[PDB]
């Protein structure tokens, strides 16, 4: 039971189901203590059973329990676990993550196969803790907090933090990913190259693997943290390190379009 | 039906009313049982509707007040041809009722909303996904408190131990409790008036060290 921004309240339907159950149970106990006739007690027990039904799995038997003035079936525990929006699929086998971002892709022709153009602001946000520590190693900020407050306001951002950010991401890689991810090449590891502008620069040769053209396609970036994660991304997931299709064994990174045309 | 309670619930509470009627009935008055029973049944049904219809429970008299306010506002909009203001409602409610009371009553009459309320055109997303958790400390807040304790331990060793530890003894860094003058006095073998004058003294010398290194600025927000 939580108070939202507007001061109003938001709550889970399980509270309503529980309320029904408790009310009917209490009423049943009172009816038993007062020596109610068999019919009344019977009906009450039936209602109790259907209340436990609605609580555990709603809509399974009979009409689904809905709130007053609404056709929306209340969400039971079974509905919570099961389904595409269920606990498993939504919150377990997949998750939303920190140290991640997204933006519109743009052709990268000047990039080496292992590189991707990464907008400055994005990298500043994604690597932010590392940038704080680096700012503390140098004389930009006395400590971490001051550096964070310094980065809170854009007008307070000078060039030294960019020059430090350059030293932060050096040698490290990031993960580029495009939806839908059909095969493991829907995610590839690239060495970020800080670029002006808000767009991510993508190498032409990986476009086939990503099934990406630029009509306004967008991609997500992720930052592997641990030395282990970075080792995995650099050795295993590097774009330049996978040149052949795991399916056919044929090259998945090969000349296409303009390249073939010129050659 | 339609008051927030299911048909069968109303039927059961009404059954309780009927039981009360049976137990309290007197055949001496030559009255049909339906007459005397109807009152108790309506009473029970109404008590139920007033009691169980809200997720956040409100007392029955306050419920009567809110319903009264609703009917009043409905009459007012009925005659005026528009939704009444708080002042007009305050007027049609008689004496004792001003705009503020009407506003607070309507504010307290607000029912909560479901977290599973549909957002988009599909079953894809829910209302509750857009609500942050303000309770649990973010990693930044945790690191803030941690580094706060770090720097506070950094600048507190600059001078004589016992007085700084007396300062901490008052502010509960050691034991996490504020000790009274007689107690915090009796700790290290002193008593009374001196202790406070030491704390200030500490806070005087505490004004020295930090002021030279100026490490405490950002944590003050």
């Amino acid at each position: 039971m939580v108070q939202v921004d507007g001061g109003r309240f938001a709550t889970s339907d399980l509270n309503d189901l529980y309320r029904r159950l408790i009310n009917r149970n209490n009423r049943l106990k009172k009816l038993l203590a007062q020596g109610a006739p068999e019919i009344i007690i019977r009906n009450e027990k039936r209602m109790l059973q259907e209340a436990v039904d609605a609580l555990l799995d709603n809509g399974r038997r009979g009409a689904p329990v809905t709130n007053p003035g609404s056709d929306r079936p209340l969400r039971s525990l079974t509905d919570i676990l099961s389904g595409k929006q269920g606990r498993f699929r939504q919150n377990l086998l997949g998750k939303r993550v920190d140290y991640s971002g997204r933006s519109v892709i743009v052709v990268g022709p000047q990039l080496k196969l292992h590189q991707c153009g990464l907008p400055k602001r994005m990298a500043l946000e994604l690597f932010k803790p590392f940038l704080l520590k680096k700012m503390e190693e140098k004389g930009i900020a006395p400590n971490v907090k001051a550096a964070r407050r310094m980065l809170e306001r854009q007008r307070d951002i000078k060039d030294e933090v960019w020059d430090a950010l350059e030293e932060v991401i050096h040698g490290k890689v990031v993960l580029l990913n495009r939806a839908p991810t059909l095969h493991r090449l829907g995610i590839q590891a690239f060495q970020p190259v800080l670029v002006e502008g808000q767009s991510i620069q993508l190498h032409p040769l990986v476009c086939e693997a990503f099934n990406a053209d630029f009509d306004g396609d967008q991609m997500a970036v992720h930052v592997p943290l641990s030395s282990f994660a970075q080792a995995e991304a650099r050795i295993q997931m590097l774009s330049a390190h996978n040149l052949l299709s795991p399916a056919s064994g044929e090259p998945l990174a090969k000349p296409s379009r303009d390249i073939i045309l010129g050659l | 039906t339609g008051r927030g309670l299911s048909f069968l619930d109303l039927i059961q509470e009404g059954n309780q009313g009927l039981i009360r009627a049976v137990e309290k009935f007197e055949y001496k008055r030559r009255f049909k049982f339906s007459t005397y029973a109807t009152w108790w049944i309506r009473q029970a049904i109404n008590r139920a509707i007033a009691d169980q219809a809200r997720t956040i429970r409100i007392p029955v008299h306050m419920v009567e007040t809110i319903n009264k306010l609703s009917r009043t506002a409905r009459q007012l909009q009925q005659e005026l041809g528009r939704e009444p203001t708080y002042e007009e409602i305050a007027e049609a409610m008689g004496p004792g009722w001003d705009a503020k009371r009407v506003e607070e009553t309507l504010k307290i009459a607000q029912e909560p909303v479901s977290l599973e309320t549909p957002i988009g055109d599909e079953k894809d997303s829910f209302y509750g996904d857009f609500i942050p958790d303000e309770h649990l400390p973010s990693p930044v807040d945790a690191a803030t408190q941690s580094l706060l304790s770090e720097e506070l331990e950094k600048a507190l060793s600059k001078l004589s131990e016992r007085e700084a530890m007396v300062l901490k003894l008052r502010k509960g860094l050691i034991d996490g409790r504020e000790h009274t003058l007689e107690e915090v006095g009796a700790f290290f073998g002193v008593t009374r008036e001196r202790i406070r004058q030491i704390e200030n003294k500490a806070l005087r010398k505490l004004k020295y060290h930090e002021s030279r290194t100026r490490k405490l600025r950002d944590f003050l927000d």
Partner: peptide, 14 residues
């Protein structure tokens, strides 16, 4: 199948 119909039937027995 319907609790209300069932209860109304059980009511008409008396």
């Amino acid at each position: 199948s319907d609790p209300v119909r069932q209860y109304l039937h059980e009511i008409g027995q008396v």
